[PDB]
Homo-oligomer: A and B are copies of this chain.
Amino acid sequence: VGAXAXVXWXWXWXWX
C-alpha cells in the first residue's frame, strides 16, 4: 500500500 516504508524520511524531527 502506498509507496516506501513508514512515514516521512529519517528518524524523529530535526538534526540533533
Contact = CB atoms under 8 A, between A and B. Distances in A.
Contact of A2 (B3, B8, B9, B14): B14
A4 B8 CA distance: 13
B13 A10 contact: no
Classify the interface of chain A: helix, strand, loop or mixed.
strand
Number of this chain's copies in the assembly equals 2
Contact of A6 (B1, B2, B5, B10): B10
A8 B10 CA distance: 6
A15 B3 CA distance: 6
A9 B11 CA distance: 5
A1 to B, nearest CB: 5
A15 B5 contact: yes
